[PDB]
Design a protein that fits this description.
Radius of gyration: 14 Å
CATH topology: Replication Protein E1, Chain: A
Oligomer: monomer
Number of strands: 5
Strand order of the largest sheet: 4-1-3-2-5
CATH class: Alpha Beta
CATH architecture: 3-Layer(aba) Sandwich
Number of domains: 1
Helix content: 10-25%
Largest sheet: 5 strands, antiparallel
Subcellular location: Host nucleus
Strand content: 25-35%
Number of helices: 3
Protein name: Large T antigen
Amino acid sequence: GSKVEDPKDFPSELLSFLSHAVFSNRTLACFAIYTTKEKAALLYKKIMEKYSVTFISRHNSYNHNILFFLTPHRHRVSAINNYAQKLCTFSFLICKGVNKEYLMYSALTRDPFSVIEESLPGGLKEHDFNPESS
């Protein structure tokens, strides 16, 4: 009714390519955290060395920011969920995994999704994902 309606999940705009699961039976190496900007600010420098983020960029959506952060080794969204989830004692939290990295980041750089900071020199690309020809 009047205050920024807290988002319980990602926006239908970015829901065109996501996982939508926390206890899946597959190991993902890319995850997109969605929570207040202050939250992504602490998980940005934190994951920076906790998962060797293949690319960590803090973007803006509508009421919060999407802390993007890939990963080298493989991990289940359940394990990464235990970390980002452990960071929910100062505000809401909606960390989830991502199936199509390149895509998400793309729809994230195009309005209304703005960009703030990133560890990559030009967002993700073929040097971050795994577009091995086929």
